[PDB]
Design a protein around this nucleic acid. Structure first.
Ligand code: GTP
Ligand code: MG
Ligand code: MG
Ligand code: MG
Lengths: 46, 49, 104, 282, 350, 51, 49, 14, 360
RNA sequence: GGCCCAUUCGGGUCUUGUAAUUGGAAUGAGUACAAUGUAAAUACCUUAACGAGGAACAAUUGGAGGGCAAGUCUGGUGCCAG
């Protein structure tokens, strides 16, 4: 019984952890990447 | 090597077989095991053919 | 100019985003959220390595500088354009080399 | 683009300074250095030129008026006690760091600088002494430069470092002390996180209020009722009794009674809003 | 009458209705250049409010609310002070009174990010006395230095890392996070020697009343019968009942061959069957990685230099190095643990 | 075992006395070379770079 | 005096801790434990993970 | 799992 | 030792104030002279909630049950479930947590189960639209109470999920010296396990009283039905007066009993809402103890809150005496310079509270 | 054995390497009896005595790569990959 509980908890924690890192990585790329590409366009305009 | 101390890149010395088990022989390490596994598979591959 | 005409921008360390990342010295661990003082705009910046992450803590001044990548690397997080060069008025490299101590 | 950069240097962490708008307490000046570097002679020299009166014996806090609106408290840190160096380093607004020029930096001098750096760096002034013991001008100039650059590593580059040559009648060169006494009055102090969040005071006087009869009928072993006096610092202390306090090196206690007293050394500018005459020592 | 009733008292419905046929009574209701200056303006603006409100108060009312302000010369009276303080009172030694916030009063487990000081010669050790300077207070504690193991657990270390920070947990009065501190091993003049004395530097990260530091505890057994993948192990467990607990546990050899504990063998006691991904050898050693809880020792020895006559020879718990020398005991050593050079003969197969 | 035990203790005590010899007779304590130059952590550099 | 009484109690704690640091560690604290080293049936107690 | 990380607890003497 | 209290009055506040201040308290003589002495079931359940959210605390209940000794620990929070006894609804357990949730080591994610409404305790929609907005003005940006199932009395069966994602050092200093202008009136009329017509019949009743007003009146009809409708039939309304200028809210609520006319309750609550507005200056009475406590636990700053002389009642006076016995802060009250009305400004200095549990 | 060219396979050339030991000579930074220097003095130039093997009389700054564990983490189609 303890074996069943431990494995389920480990999988859930592993699933949640991968969800968080994917979220914070994607949000950084999307929002900051926009600002970078925006700035790169202004510099090209100059 | 960028932003790494020399202390970080320190050789980790590797152990030996216990004295109580000294009769049996050399304590195999991962590199030693890899040589065995490849050798067996090479022979088994030809024997299968 | 990314900083509104300046080469370096003073900021406030709001949070260390990647503190919970399991993999040591990952690209995410070296990221810190910084609030630019000049306009209050929140931005994310790189730290040179996880070792220098210990020095950086919340609510301390940081001087930022552009982070230039010569070539694409597998693990980089594109979009983070800034790297921390000074914390509390002391060079972070100097702290990393133990040639100074951060004054609080 | 220098105009942009200079503006950046003005930008800092917003912070709240709890110094009252009127009648601030005296600033604490800590004279810290290894034994025999001349902490006592420096205090006497500074006390005389600001007050024009000489203290033959100095012990514990000494409050003097250094300016029209500026008041100063001196403290001689015991050089041989490390426990002392810790708790001065937490309250000292200004530290006069004594260094022996002939011998150079010492372990205790470094240790206090590292203690101070971790508890919030206060203003630190380097005072170089025993420069008369040198026999050559050439070696003296090199030692001064070497001492100055090392001191610039611990404290911001360009930090002011004072040079004292010799001692006459237990006093330093008069013209040299004046440059120091101004720089203490010119100094503008910084808001530090810990000092602006807790109340503390340097006991100016100590007195035992325990009744002598109690001492006899029970014995000296009986605990004592004590009163302490001193200016308050930092955040206001609550008026009501019962607040918890810690006395460094003694333990924790609760304020049994508290009462404000007239200032023994009121600043002159205060009296006038109501000069050699104006300068006072307590 | 009492706030346990969230709903407030109201008049009877009909009277409220008559009051509110007509609702005429209630009809009456229905640039700073830089962001830094804006924050400073907000601070200064609020600080202006305090002076205005206090000025409107009576002087007695001011003292009642704000208390005694800085700059006030004040007489504070204490009771139950130790008699040594008045007797062994040296005017040269300062007396610093420090007010305490409610957090400082509590005692518990303090979590700090701690490093050996760069100029300190030796690395600190776990469960090794250290005199700390937190807030207004100085005291001696027994810290435990730990590591995150890729942020999965709180594993106990043996010593501070040579040139980097490591999480430390020690028992003592609590303090707010962002409270820096320093540590010293020796405060007496007798043991000052010549070496640099500031031992540790760090910042408190978290305060708690409990902690679950854990230590890696590795069970070791040896094989005595090997059958291709399957193999029998011995010396890991002392009785079959122990094996019953660990059935299905993951194990590995030194060689890196992973395996599982399948079942306990009836004869002899403690032997069991394990299946490995590949054939193991007799020279190999099987290891079960297990974790054992560790507890922070509750030792609190506040430094009381002023109370002592010397005031400069305070001595508390001694290091593990010094205690051994006094009792003439040797540094414990394990012959198998030591490292030796090993020469590998070239491997050849039939 | 006692004979070897006494040997280890004696060797340790000799080292502590040798360390004690380093402390200067004058009470004044000087900063060592590490504090004075403050070179910190540096890579190993070939002597050829010196000139 | 009260302070002297407190000093005595701390002087009892200090001695106990001094022996503990000198004394050989429990089997659990020692890494790499074996069947012979530990007491019999100890694992049944510890409730390891 | 509830008892793992608690030092307090309700003490009911009724 | 212990700051001693008497009786059961302000039981939740005295524990919460003790937990916030960290000062141990002792409360004695709880229902001494009654036939049934000592703590009620809902009170002891309330205590158990504290240890689920605090760590290291020592609560000791005397043998007779009339005296309790509380030594507060550190707010730890976390995810948990609490089964609220039928003697009190979930709101009786929710509201004290709102004082503590922004001051935790980990976000509060508490699932309450039991009755979701009563005649004397805060309702779900009072907490959602009536108390949280007060916190939002105090700097708790993220707070929510999710209604998964409603449970009407006497059988209940409801469950609500309290989530406070916002953790802050201390509440922002308050400055409200004006009388907010009400832009609109909204509210939630709900029913369970009955015909939907009842909700409309209330909305007719409330609309009848409020139509004299010159502001919009839009009341939502939240009919609950199906598995999520609880186990007993019930219905009630809550009307909230909103001031969009500065996000201020006043509200009044009530639920319906067997044999009661839906139109009449809609008339009564809307009548009471106007009464509360008449009695309000910046925050209504049922909001005030939250506002008073939060200003006490602010920075070392002077907070100004305008209050009406009608608000300063026996409930107000007893609150302030309780605050001083723990915190020792005194609230000074000054009249306003205006002559059109009779308000007074409450000035309070925060004790410099800081959220020291949160890891950084 | 060292080095050079070459995607590939390979091709070209010869006193090279030491992570070894060792000798006596030379001199400046420095420290200084001096003199010169200068209103006096510092500095410079000159010069009695001392001043080199880790010549510890201990210049830096930046980059490119390796390799190691009964170590930790992640994903899988065992023994793999990151
Ligand atoms: N020649 C010379 N003597 C000095 C100098 N500074 C201090 N002294 C001497 O050093 C001695 C020490 O004087 P003190 O005033 O007692 O120094 P201190 O700071 O009080 O030392 P503590 O005993 O620890 O308090 C006196 O004889 C001083 O004349 C200096 O620059 N040159
Ligand atoms: Mg002296
Ligand atoms: Mg320099
Ligand atoms: Mg040679």
């Amino acid at each position: 019984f303890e074996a069943r509980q431990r494995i389920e908890e480990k999988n859930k924690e592993s699933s949640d952890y991968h969800a968080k890192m994917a979220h914070i990585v994607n949000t950084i790329n999307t929002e900051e990447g926009a600002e970078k590409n925006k700035y790169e366009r202004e510099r090209k305009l100059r | 090597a960028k932003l790494v101390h020399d202390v970080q890149k320190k050789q980790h010395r590797e152990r030996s077989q216990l004295t109580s088990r000294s009769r049996y022989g050399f304590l195999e390490k991962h590199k030693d095991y890899v040589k065995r596994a490849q050798d067996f598979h090479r022979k088994q591959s030809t024997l299968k053919v | 100019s990314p900083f509104g005409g300046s080469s370096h921008a003073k900021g406030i360390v709001l949070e260390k985003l990647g503190i919970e990342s399991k993999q040591p010295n990952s690209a995410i661990r070296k990221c810190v959220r910084v609030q630019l003082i000049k306009n209050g705009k929140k931005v994310t910046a790189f730290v040179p390595n996880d070792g220098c992450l210990n020095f950086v803590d919340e609510n301390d001044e940081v001087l930022l500088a552009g982070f230039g990548r010569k070539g694409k690397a597998k693990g980089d997080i594109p979009g983070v354009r800034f790297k921390v060069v000074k914390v509390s008025g002391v060079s972070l490299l100097a702290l990393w080399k133990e040639k100074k101590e951060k004054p609080r | 683009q220098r105009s942009s950069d200079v503006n950046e240097r003005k930008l800092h962490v917003p912070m709240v300074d709890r110094t009252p708008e009127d009648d601030p307490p005296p600033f604490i000046v800590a004279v810290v250095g290894p034994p025999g570097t001349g902490k006592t002679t420096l205090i006497r020299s500074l006390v005389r030129r600001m007050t024009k009166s000489t203290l033959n014996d100095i012990q514990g806090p000494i409050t003097v008026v250094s300016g029209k609106h500026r008041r100063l408290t001196f403290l001689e840190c015991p050089a041989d006690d490390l426990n002392a160096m810790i708790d001065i380093a937490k309250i000292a607004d200004l530290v006069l760091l004594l260094i022996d020029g002939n011998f150079g930096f010492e372990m205790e001098t470094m240790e206090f600088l590292n203690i101070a750096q971790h508890h919030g760096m206060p203003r630190v002034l380097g005072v170089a002494t025993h420069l008369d013991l040198f026999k050559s001008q050439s070696t003296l100039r090199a030692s001064k430069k070497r001492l100055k650059h090392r001191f610039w590593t611990e404290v911001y580059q360009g930090a002011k470092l004072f040079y004292l040559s010799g001692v006459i009648n237990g006093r330093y060169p008069d013209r040299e002390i004046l440059n120091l006494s101004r720089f203490i009055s010119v100094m503008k102090f910084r808001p530090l996180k810990w000092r602006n969040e807790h109340p503390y005071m340097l006991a100016d006087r100590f007195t035992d209020l325990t009744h002598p009869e109690l001492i006899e009928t029970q014995g000296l072993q009986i605990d004592r009722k004590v009163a302490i006096y001193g200016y308050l610092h930092g955040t206001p202390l609550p008026s009501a009794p019962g607040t918890r306090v810690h006395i460094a090196g003694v333990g924790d206690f609760s304020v049994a009674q508290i009462e404000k007293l007239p200032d023994p050394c009121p600043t002159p500018f205060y009296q006038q809003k109501l000069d050699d005459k104006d300068k006072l020592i307590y | 009458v009492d706030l346990e009733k969230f709903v407030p008292y109201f008049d009877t419905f009909e009277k409220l209705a008559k009051k509110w046929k007509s609702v005429d009574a209630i009809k009456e209701r229905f640039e700073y250049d830089t962001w830094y200056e804006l924050q400073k303006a907000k601070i200064s603006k609020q600080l202006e409010i305090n002076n205005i409100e206090y000025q409107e108060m009576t002087p007695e009312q001011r003292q009642r609310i704000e208390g005694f302000k800085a700059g006030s010369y004040v007489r504070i009276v204490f009771e139950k002070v130790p008699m040594e303080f008045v007797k062994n009172f040296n005017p040269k030694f300062p007396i610093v009174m420090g007010g305490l916030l409610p957090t400082e009063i509590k005692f518990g487990i303090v979590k700090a990010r701690l490093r050996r000081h760069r100029w300190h010669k030796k690395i600190l050790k776990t469960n090794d006395p250290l005199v700390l300077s937190l807030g207004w207070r100085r005291f001696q504690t027994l810290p435990i230095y730990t590591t995150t193991d890729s942020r999965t657990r709180t594993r106990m270390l043996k010593y501070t890392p040579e040139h980097t920070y490591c999480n430390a947990a020690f028992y003592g009065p609590l303090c707010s996070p962002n409270t820096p501190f320093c540590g010293v091993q020796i405060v007496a003049n007798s043991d000052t020697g010549n070496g640099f004395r500031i031992a540790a530097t760090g910042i408190v990260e978290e305060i708690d009343v409990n902690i679950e530091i854990v230590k890696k505890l590795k069970l070791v057994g040896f094989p005595y019968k090997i059958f291709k993948n399957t193999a029998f192990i011995k010396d890991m467990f002392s009785s079959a009942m122990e094996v019953a607990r660990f059935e299905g546990a993951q194990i590995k050899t030194v060689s890196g061959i992973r395996g599982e504990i399948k079942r306990a063998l009836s004869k002899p006691e403690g032997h069991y069957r394990a299946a490995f991904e590949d054939k193991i050898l007799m020279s190999d050693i099987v290891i079960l990685r297990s974790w054992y809880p560790v507890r922070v020792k509750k030792f609190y020895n506040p430094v009381t230099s002023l109370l002592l006559k010397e005031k400069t020879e305070w001595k508390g718990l001694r290091l593990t190095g010094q205690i051994r020398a006094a009792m003439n005991l040797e540094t414990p050593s394990n012959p198998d643990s030591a490292y030796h050079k090993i020469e590998r003969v070239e491997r050849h197969f039939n | 075992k006692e004979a070897h035990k006494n040997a280890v203790i004696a060797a340790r005590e000799g080292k502590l006395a040798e360390l004690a010899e380093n402390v200067s007779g004058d009470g004044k304590r000087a900063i060592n070379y590490q504090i004075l130059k403050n070179k910190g952590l540096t890579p190993k550099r070939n002597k050829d770079n010196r000139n | 005096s009260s302070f002297e009484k407190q000093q005595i109690e701390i002087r009892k704690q200090i001695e106990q801790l001094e022996n503990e640091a000198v004394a050989e560690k429990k089997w659990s604290l020692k890494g790499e434990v074996k069947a012979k080293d530990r007491p019999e049936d100890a694992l049944l107690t510890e409730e390891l993970e | 799992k509830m008892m793992k990380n608690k030092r307090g607890g309700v003490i009911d003497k009724r | 030792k212990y700051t001693t209290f008497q009786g059961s009055q302000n039981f939740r506040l005295r524990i919460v104030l003790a937990t916030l201040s960290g000062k141990p308290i002792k409360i004695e003589k709880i229902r001494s002279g009654d036939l049934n002495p000592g703590l009620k079931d809902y009170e002891v359940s309330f205590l158990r909630l504290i240890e689920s959210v605090t760590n290291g605390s020592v609560i000791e209940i005397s043998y007779t049950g009339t005296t309790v000794i509380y030594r507060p620990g550190i707010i730890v929070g976390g995810a948990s479930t609490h089964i609220c006894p039928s003697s009190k609804p979930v709101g009786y357990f929710v509201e004290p947590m709102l004082y503590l949730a922004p001051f935790s080591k980990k976000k509060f994610s508490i699932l309450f189960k039991g009755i979701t409404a009563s005649h004397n305790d805060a309702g779900i929609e009072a907490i959602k639209w009536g108390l949280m907005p007060v916190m939002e003005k105090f700097g708790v940006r993220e707070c929510a109470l999710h209604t998964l199932k409603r449970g009407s009395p006497p059988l209940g069966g409801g469950e609500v999920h309290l989530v406070v994602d916002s953790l802050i050092a201390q509440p922002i200093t308050m400055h409200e010296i004006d009388r907010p202008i009400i832009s609109s009136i909204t509210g939630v009329a709900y029913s369970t396990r009955v015909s939907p017509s009842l909700v409309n019949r209330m909305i007719d009743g409330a609309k009848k009283v409020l139509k004299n007003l010159q502001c919009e009146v839009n009341i939502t009809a939240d009919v609950w039905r199906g598995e999520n409708s609880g186990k007993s039939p019930g219905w009630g309304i809550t009307l909230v007066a909103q001031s969009k200028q500065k996000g201020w809210s006043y509200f009044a609520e009530d639920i319906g009993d067997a044999g009661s006319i839906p139109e009449e309750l809609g008339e009564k609550v809307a009548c009471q809402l106007l009464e509360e507005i008449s009695k309000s200056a910046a925050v209504g009475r049922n909001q005030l103890p939250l506002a008073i406590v939060y200003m006490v636990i602010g920075k070392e700053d002077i907070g100004r809150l305008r209050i009406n002389k009608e608000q300063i009642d026996e409930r107000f006076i007893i609150l302030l005496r309780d605050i001083k016995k723990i915190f020792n802060t005194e609230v000074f009250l000054k009249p306003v310079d205006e002559a059109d009305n009779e308000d007074m400004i409450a000035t309070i200095k925060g004790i410099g509270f800081t959220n020291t549990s949160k890891k950084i």
